[PDB]
Amino acid sequence: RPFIAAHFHGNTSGLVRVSHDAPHDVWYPAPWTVASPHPRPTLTRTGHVHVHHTGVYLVYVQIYYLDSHDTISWVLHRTNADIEGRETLLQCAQSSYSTEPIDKPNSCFSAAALFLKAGDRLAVRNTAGDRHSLMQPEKSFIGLVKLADAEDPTQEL
Amino acid sequence: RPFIAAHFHGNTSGLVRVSHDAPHDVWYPAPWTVASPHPRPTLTRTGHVHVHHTGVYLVYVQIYYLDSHDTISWVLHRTNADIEGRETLLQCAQSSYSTEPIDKPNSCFSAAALFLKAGDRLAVRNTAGDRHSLMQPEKSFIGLVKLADAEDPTQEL
Amino acid sequence: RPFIAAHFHGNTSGLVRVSHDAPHDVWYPAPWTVASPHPRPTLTRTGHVHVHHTGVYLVYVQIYYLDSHDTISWVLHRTNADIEGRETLLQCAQSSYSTEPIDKPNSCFSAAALFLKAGDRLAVRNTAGDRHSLMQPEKSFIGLVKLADAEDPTQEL
């Protein structure tokens, strides 16, 4: 049974400013992913995760913010040659009120079983412009594990 | 190998007020769950997840709050014809102090490998009365994936 | 197929003060883990999870803090006879500013697909001294599920 899976983590080879509408792109495959003998999702030079096999995947994302804004939030965007624009599959948010801009650490994690198609690209974007995150391997990452085969469950109208 | 798994996400077809002790009930199966050819957990009209196969499951829950209370928290309640009342399997909490009631977004995620019996019902309740959450598919959801067969690991005394 | 997996949860048989640099050690296997007929990770008397089989694991941790500090954070430490000191595999953080020390609940969850070797020990430590957490089964836990075989993906230089 092939292990169609990959883990990519932050690697600045760690504070990174992410501009409005830019995807997080300081990802790098973990060693077990680099060494994996299995067909698997891959990482593009733009920071997108490139899915090569259709199925239901467990997808998980963590962004570790070190930021002074009251609200930090990310979205997982899915693109594909067969759809116009982006689809938002997952969202995480953390928020607290402060009167002054104090930098503070907050990791925002989410995960779900998601249907993904061969040819999909996945990117993580912040929902609002200019947030700072720590791109260190234990702090920020995106990974996915194929759980089952599946036909496309949606059709056009 | 059957994929005994399901994902249900928020769908108001998105802000919902959840009354004290009421379960979150604006769930709907994701398309891959609707289309799944496999035996799987199902969703009742009360919002409970109905487990049909005994085993160890990965269970995950996210509630996306948009609320002005200082503390937001949910509990995962397990019921079954063979037990009196509810069992709390999982709990999530987020809290910060503010002097005035400012609405702010906070997603509360948790997951674990849990033993579930055929006939179990699972519901998510807030721990305190009247919190508002965003019931949109990318923001709030509950899913489970059977990982292994298992006999009942507890017995009565 | 063996289910090489275990779940350990907080059990004070629930507020616990964890001293600086001490590992969380009020863990206990969940009933399905106690009853599992499979080879699996085990729990040491020091609170470390003892890995017995090399592979890629889904590892997840939740610490439920009930604490008055502005920042709460934990790290997952990996040790092994073949490495000097500790490796940090995973980190979670939550932070908000308050002018006075008000106790408040915050669960800090993270998970990832991690390469683990037979003989590894895993411990959860707080990053800063003296935080209080609730060691109740639904609130705080550490679990892992082996997903695939894997050779050691790193070599010395």
Author numbering:
A (entry chain A), B (entry chain A), C (entry chain A): 1 to 13, 27 to 170
What does the paper say about this structure?
Like other TNF members, Eiger is a type II transmembrane protein with a single membrane-spanning helix, an intracellular portion, and an ectodomain harbouring the name-giving TNFα domain. Eiger activates the Jun N-terminal Kinase (JNK) signalling pathway by binding to its cognate TNF receptor. Two receptors of Eiger have been identified, termed Grindelwald and Wengen and which of these is utilized may be context and tissue specific. We crystallized the ectodomain of endogenous Eiger of S. frugiperda, an important agricultural pest which impacts food security, and solved its structure.
